[PDB]
Amino acid sequence: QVQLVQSGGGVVKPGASLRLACSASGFTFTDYYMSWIRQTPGKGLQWLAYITKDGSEKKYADSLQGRFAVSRDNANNLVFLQLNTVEDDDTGVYYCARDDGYYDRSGYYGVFDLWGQGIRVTVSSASTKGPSVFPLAPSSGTAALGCLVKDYFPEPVTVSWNSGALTSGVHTFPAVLQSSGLYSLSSVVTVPSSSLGTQTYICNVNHKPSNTKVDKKVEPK
Amino acid sequence: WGSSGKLISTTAVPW
Amino acid sequence: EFLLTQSPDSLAVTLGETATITCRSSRNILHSLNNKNYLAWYQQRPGQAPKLLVIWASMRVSGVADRFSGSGSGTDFALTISSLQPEDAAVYYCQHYYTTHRTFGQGTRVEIRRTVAAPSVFIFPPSDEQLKSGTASVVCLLNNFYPREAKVQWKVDNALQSGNSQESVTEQDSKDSTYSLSSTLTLSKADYEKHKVYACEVTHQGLSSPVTKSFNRG
């Protein structure tokens, strides 16, 4: 199967360094240039670096001021990106991509025809912390209820309802980053108001970075 | 002339 | 040096109709040696990596639906999606490869157009559990509305709040093409206990006048 599987990444303190890895399968790795591309809220989709087939030549986006270093290991079908002296602008999702193109004496001209799944890079001095889970109780037609998943770090959390049995009407929202450096997320569901005395509603929260699993029963107040 | 892959290289020139 | 600017920033398209996205380059990227434009297009769906659609401005790559067509020359380019399908709701990016320092446009978000739908609005007081910890979060839910543009204002004893709330919005729903929005007002327990009425006021194209949901602390 033709694919690029990424690893590494995660949380890095401002000023420190972080390594990203990508593992290629299903094609002749040494026939290809490889590139890294990130997506950040402030700078959009941004090509960062490419490395030639034999790993000898590297090119970088000038705005990185030389802070990033791409390398490859052709004996093991790996390519790497090292982020150094990281800063808040470096937070985002980083992709490896296969680079298909041509080169003449003037340069290399190409496109990105196969992409890894992306890896989250979070630049933060915050410590890993599991969430508090608070009920959003139904008010007392249609009722709304939910769970507030507050003060965790890093992303992501997942939320299910009734161990995955309840999906209709569920909305789990994008998390927000609070000024404390911790994230907060809500998950809601709308249900028949008539079910509130007879149906149990449990939100199942999983924060893998902290190995925290919590189930919270949500009842009328 | 060098090629990384073939999608772009084989279509960069009419001939 | 080479700047790509897409327009519009976002586009709502009725299913089965035609979407047109444009990409302008600040510099010519047609090379006379091979008469090719060094321009590519990508599609990015939520939670996924971008996917290559088109190379050389107008050549679809393998597997790409033929309802996508790239056009243009020199400095002005377009991606046209005929007979738009639900899977075509995505962010589209152009990319030049005229130099060794490639850049992308800023992306154009294509959403499905549907009829106007007013939000259902709900407000949630802080839980007793949270309050025991020293903080109060008040949550306002706007459920299943269209178009995406909505305004939520927090009012505390009728006083308009600023700077102490955060919100986020779901991806467009695959079933009914609506959006939902969550907003959280956060105060210290002490500040929370200094006031009585907590309200979120919602303004939206589907409401003939703003809708307010509120509760009295207690």
Resolution at which this structure was determined, Å: 1.7
A3-123 and A132-218 share one fold? yes
Are residue C108 and residue C148 in the same domain, yes or no? no
Instruction: Examine the fold and report which residue of C78, C112, C146 is the final residue of a domain before the chain moves on.
Output: C112
**Among candidates C53, C55, C6, which has minimal Cα distance to C26?**
C6
Q: What is the identity of the amino acid at C134? A: G
Q: In 3-state terms, what secondary structure has residue C14?
A: coil
> Closest Cα of chain C to A172: distance in Å?
7
Count CB neighbours of A89 within 10 A: 12
Are residue C49 and residue C9 in the same domain, yes or no? yes
Q: Method used for this model?
A: X-ray
DSSP label at residue C116:
-
Count CB neighbours of A17 within 10 A: 14
Are residue C20 and residue C71 in the same domain, yes or no? yes
**Cα C185 to Cα C17, C141, C215, distances in angstroms:** 40, 12, 14
Q: A21, A7 in Cβ contact below 8 A?
A: yes
> Closest Cα of chain A to B4: distance in Å?
5
The CATH number for C91's domain is 2.60.40.10
The superfamily (CATH) of domain A132-218 is Immunoglobulins (2.60.40.10)
Instruction: Examine the fold and report which residue of C112, C128, C147 is the final residue of a domain before the chain moves on.
Output: C112
Q: Which CATH architecture has domain A3-123?
A: Sandwich (2.60)
Distance CA(C206)–CA(C162), nearest Å, equals 25
User: Which residues have C-beta within 8 Å of that of residue C62, sequence separation ≥ 6?
Assistant: none
**Residues of A with Cβ-Cβ distance to B11 under 8 angstroms:** none
Q: A1, A26 in Cβ contact below 8 A?
A: yes
Residue C164 gets the label, from left (phi > 0), alpha (psi -120 to 50) or beta, of: alpha
Cβ distance A148 to C168 less than 8 Å, yes or no, reads no
Encoded tokens for A184: 């907060």
Are residue C166 and residue C91 in the same domain, yes or no? no
Cis peptide before C8 (omega within 30 of 0): yes
Domain hosting C151: range is 120-216
Are residue C177 and residue C209 in the same domain, yes or no? yes
**Interrupted backbone of chain A, residues before each interruption (C–N > 2.5 Å):** 140
Are residue C99 and residue C131 in the same domain, yes or no? no
Residue C192 phi, psi (nearest 5): -50, -45
Are residue C149 and residue C92 in the same domain, yes or no? no
Instruction: Examine the fold and report which residue of C47, C77, C112 is the final residue of a domain before the chain moves on.
Output: C112
Interface probe, candidates B1, B4, B6, B8, chain C, greatest C C-beta count within 10 A: B8
Are residue C146 and residue C93 in the same domain, yes or no? no
Q: Where are the domains of chain A?
A: 3-123, 132-218
Are residue C105 and residue C129 in the same domain, yes or no? no
**Residues of A with Cβ-Cβ distance to C126 under 8 angstroms:** 134
Q: A193, A145 in Cβ contact below 8 A?
A: no
Alpha helix stretches (DSSP H) within chain A: none
Are residue C15 and residue C42 in the same domain, yes or no? yes
